[PDB]
Paper text:
Mammalian telomeric DNA, composed of tandem telomeric TTAGGG repeats, is specifically bound by the shelterin complex. Mammalian telomeres, like bulk genomic DNA, are also packaged into nucleosomes. Among these subunits, TRF1 and TRF2 each bind double-stranded (ds) telomeric DNA as preformed homodimers and thus associate shelterin with ds telomeric repeats. Here, we determined the cryo–electron microscopy (cryo-EM) structures of an unbound human telomeric nucleosome core particle (teloNCP) and TRF1-bound teloNCP.
(B) Cryo-EM reconstruction (2.7 Å) and (C) the atomic model of TRF1core-teloNCP complex, respectively. Our TRF1core-teloNCP structure reveals that 1.5 turns of double-helix DNA at the entry/exit site are unwrapped from the histone octamer, and TRF1 directly binds the unwrapped DNA. TRF1 binding changes the DNA trajectory by approximately 51°. Consequently, the TRF1-bound region of the nucleosomal DNA adopts a linear conformation similar to that previously observed in the TRF1 Myb domain structure bound to naked telomeric DNA. One Myb domain, termed Myb1, binds the outer DNA gyre spanning SHL −5.5 to −6.5, while the other Myb domain, termed Myb2, binds the adjacent inner DNA gyre by inserting between nucleosomal DNA and the histone octamer. TRF1 binding to the nucleosome results in a register shift in the nucleosomal DNA. We resolved the acidic C terminus of Myb2 (residues 431 to 439), which was disordered in the previous crystal structure of TRF1 Myb domain. The Myb2 tail extensively interacts with the basic N-terminal tail of histone H3 (residues 39 to 53), displacing the DNA phosphate backbone found in the same region in the apo-teloNCP structure (right). The phosphoserine side chain of S434 hydrogen bonds with Tyr41 (Y41) of histone H3, mimicking the DNA backbone phosphate observed in the apo-teloNCP structure. In our structure, helix 1 (residues 384 to 396) of Myb2 makes a secondary contact with the DNA major groove at SHL +1.5.
Numbering used by the authors:
A (entry chain A), F (entry chain E): 37 to 134
B (entry chain M): 375 to 439
C (entry chain B): 20 to 102
D (entry chain D): 25 to 122
E (entry chain C), I (entry chain G): 10 to 119
G (entry chain F): 18 to 102
H (entry chain H): 24 to 122
J (entry chain L): 377 to 435
DNA sequence: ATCTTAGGGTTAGGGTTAGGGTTAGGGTTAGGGTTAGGGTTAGGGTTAGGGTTAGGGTTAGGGTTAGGGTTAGGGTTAGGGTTAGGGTTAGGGTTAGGGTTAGGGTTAGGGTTAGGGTTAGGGTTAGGGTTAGGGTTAGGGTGAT
DNA sequence: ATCACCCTAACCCTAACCCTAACCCTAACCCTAACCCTAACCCTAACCCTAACCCTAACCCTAACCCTAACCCTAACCCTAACCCTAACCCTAACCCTAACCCTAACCCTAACCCTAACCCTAACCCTAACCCTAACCCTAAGAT
């Protein structure tokens, strides 16, 4: 039985890792594919500037991070440390997104 | 030196160093170099890399004690 | 051609990173699919508005300023990319 | 013999529409105030969005295009579709009658 | 001599004032120049939105056995329609109240 | 034996009663005094139109009602029926009011 | 003339707050809610009245009008219909 | 002869001057200057829009320093507003004194 | 015979451009006319806000032993000031990140 | 820091002679051997890279 | 004693200025012309500050029970550790589609004015809405089966 | 669970009254028609930038798995705080009157702003050498055995 870290120690280490950094946490190529696929519905044969996709990525990551902050508060309010989809639903419900 | 091309550390070698330092114990740079795989590194090179990783907090934090 | 199932490109590892920056300690397994839906809705709204701005300008290329305007009108101002 | 300044409003205009929609339904003064507020709000919204579009595009005129794009940006979905249709219909008839 | 004047609302087939809307656009510091079709388009959109709301409000009134729209009826019309609710989400109607809604968990057991 | 409704019955009747009407639920004169007291901090010898106090009352009442809707959702999320001040705090934090 | 006012926040009584909660769809109310709600109403009003008075002062007037309150509310993202907006 | 290239404007020069006032030795990156430019344009639009609405409400045709002062008091929060008002008044006084 | 040109910023003791602000006010369709004092006041306010943020950002960069301000430092400065945070509550800084914050409930219970 | 200071003939020829004497890459010791007023090790490195880029260096 | 480790010092290579030059592009100054808004006054309208009443709404207290808080225990996930491999990233080109700039027209929108069509304000009335009084039904509560 | 009374409150129905909506009339105001005039916008054509596309190649992140412990969830129990109801009392709602005080139109008139035209000045690119930042590597200096 080699040295094994109890769960929660590694979670706290990562929280500190990613709250200290500023790089994007979603890989660029998948996100670009997603953006192009979504835009296909609104218009066909649409070109995208390099920076336009970058701006979209920054906005999406910021949005998801804020949403998880709110989600975590909702989860803690229910005497849990694990976030569940109802926490997300409630947070979007109150923010007005619904 | 000019003859030895400066090359960077691969994920494969940081893992390996990481692992050994655990098993063979910190400071046994010679035997970690023996039982693991590295890209023509030397005992000192592992030392320098460990120092840099500690500087950049890529080492697992010291355990609460 | 057409793209397909690119949403799955937003992997679980990536969603867990976004959560950790949000301060989350444990993540249920059902969140990953939820988050994908949320992201998709957000992107559709923003991209719809950006494409409208692009279409008004008679352009065929979506510029960063188009995205900046679309975000501002949805009450999410963004600094760094112009404007 | 001082003259008190006239107050413009959309009441007669809304009453005409009300009798088109519901021939024998009335409206109270409080509700007509709500409708005036509504019309002024939507006017301001559409005009402001049209203003920015022209500014963004370095154009010095608000045209029916700008109004159409503002309507598409502001009104959600089926409302936007029907509003665009109504506007286009009205501008065509206006143009035809000279 | 001068031909008999026909209002621009009549030409466009609208009820709302194309002429006043044009004046408000010109005097509202929205842009240097205002096109000829802009006031027509905007007046048409405003009339459409008004007619939508008023239709739903009159339907709401009939259901309450009232022959006259009050703010309650406007609130019921707006809140019970998805797109209008979306459009006027951040709007408060004076003397309008709220939609009747009780959570299921709060209801009696049986 | 006299009649007594069980707990939560009269509360449901009141919910149905006050979700069906539109009148203001805060007495007018006390609220008017509160408005004047708050305003004298900013400026003295200040007059109010009757309509200004009413508009303030409508705005305040609407705000509190909506806040109570969100608070009740937080309470239900915590598997409770009673609202508690932590619920109000969570709702206000998620809404961005703090 | 023009005397002081004091304590008037307690005029938002417990019954009134229960009524507002009932309209919000609340079945049971904690006893600590009533002081909480008073504080929240305290802040909301101050924010609105401050802006409404700023608007009044810009116009070189001493009477707060309904339009001042409407503009104040609007700039906080709470548009109000029915008072001359 | 050749196609001339249209020039963009920014507040980079002025922001750099202000930085050299507050932090003589500190420098700033290009991304950070982009953010500063965005900030200045955002605040400018906010204040100018509020001043425009103030002038429209009071049926005035001019945006004077009064409206800018009122707009600042309406937008900026607390101390920010107080200090900004002082800075604005100081600048206007100094400008008016030397024609 | 024209007197030496002294810029309007120098007259007001400012580093931000009064002339450019005047032009932007005139071209932005904000009103019919713009006063002489308005651009001076606005330039002063913009310069004040810039100075505040830059001071705090420089302090934040010094705290990390960095001689150059990056978006992280602007993010830290704005989100650690109550008033600047209130002013820029709805703004996203690109490559700014979040301010480190872990809830107390999640911390290890020793 | 200090003002920009350019490279003249004297500290050019000395550096060429040094790369010849102490060998390339040995900037620190060359710095010591010759007189390169106000020239740090890295300055020596960047200067020689400028030599390589401008084709001012040949055996 | 010698290969090995510690710790300070040097270097490699990508990235970031400083400065010098060039010039689109606008800011400043001077002089003429026009009007928005400051200043003053009068007069009408509005709100604040008294009073009085009565009746509905608030408040204090008692009885009771339901829901919140706590604890114990079992089952269910989530996450840590490990490994294989492929998807994203990094680098190097090509090309053509589209965004941008440059003249040359021209028609659409601004400015002005006379006159009539339209709309806001004041006056008047009747019917939709409300309030009071009397049943009537929907449903909650308790005790008995 | 299951009806069966008992009892309360929301519902309905009539009647009376009523005050607010809805219609009419008029006068002032602003929209329209007609006629210049000019520049914003449209159209065409050339020109250069960058987004899309195609390769190669190797990294390291992702997916999959197994094994546990930590977590969620529920059920049982206790107690206390909130709900419901009653009675005593107080303060809000409604109305009226009066008196300062404020808002605003009317009129005058003058700084303050707009609008050109010359004349520079400063910022905006570009481009290359000089300097910086930081991880990878080096050089000795003890030192475990």
């Amino acid at each position: 039985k080699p040295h094994r870290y109890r769960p929660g120690t590694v979670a706290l280490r990562e929280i500190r890792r990613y709250q200290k950094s500023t790089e994007l946490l979603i890989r660029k190529l998948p996100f670009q594919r997603l953006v192009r696929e979504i835009a296909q519905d609104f218009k066909t044969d649409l070109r995208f500037q390099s920076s336009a996709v970058m701006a979209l990525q920054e906005a999406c990551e910021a949005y998801l991070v804020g949403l998880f902050e709110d989600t975590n508060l909702c989860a803690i309010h229910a005497k849990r440390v694990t976030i569940m989809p109802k926490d997300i639903q409630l947070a979007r419900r109150i923010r007005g997104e619904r | 030196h000019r003859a030895r091309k400066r090359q960077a550390w691969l994920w494969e070698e940081d893992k390996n160093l990481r692992s050994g330092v655990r098993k063979y114990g910190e400071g046994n740079w010679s035997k970690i170099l023996l039982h693991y795989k590295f890209n023509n590194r030397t005992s000192v090179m592992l030392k320098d890399r460990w120092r840099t990783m500690k500087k950049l907090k890529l080492i697992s934090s010291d355990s609460e004690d | 051609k057409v793209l397909r199932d690119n949403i799955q490109g937003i992997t679980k590892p990536a969603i867990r990173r976004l959560a950790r920056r949000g301060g989350v300690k444990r993540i249920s397994g059902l969140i990953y699919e939820e988050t994908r839906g949320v992201l998709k809705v957000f992107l559709e709204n923003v991209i719809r508005d950006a494409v409208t701005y692009t279409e008004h300008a008679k352009r065929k290329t979506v510029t960063a300023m188009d995205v900046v305007y679309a975000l501002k009108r949805q009450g999410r101002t963004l600094y760094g990319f112009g404007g | 013999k001082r003259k008190r300044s006239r107050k413009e409003s959309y009441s007669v205009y809304v009453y005409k529409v009300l009798k088109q929609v519901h021939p024998d339904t009335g409206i109270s003064s409080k509700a007509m105030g709500i409708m005036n507020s509504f019309v002024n709000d939507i006017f301001e919204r559409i005009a402001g969005e049209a203003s920015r579009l022209a500014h963004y595009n370095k154009r010095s005129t608000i045209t029916s295009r700008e109004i159409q794009t503002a309507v598409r940006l502001l009104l959600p979905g089926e409302l936007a579709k029907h509003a665009v249709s109504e506007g286009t219909k009205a501008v065509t008839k206006y143009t035809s009658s000279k | 001599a001068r031909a008999k004047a026909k209002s621009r609302s009549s030409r466009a087939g609208l009820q709302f004032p194309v002429g006043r809307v044009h004046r408000l656009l010109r005097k509202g510091n929205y842009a240097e120049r205002v096109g000829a079709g802009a006031p027509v388009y905007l007046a048409a959109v405003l009339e459409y939105l008004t007619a939508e709301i008023l239709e739903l409000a009159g339907n709401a009134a009939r259901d309450n056995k009232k022959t006259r729209i009050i703010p309650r009826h406007l609130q019921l019309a707006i809140r019970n329609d998805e797109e209008l609710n979306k459009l006027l989400g951040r709007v408060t109607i004076a003397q309008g109240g709220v939609l009747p809604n009780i959570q299921a968990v709060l209801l009696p057991k049986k």
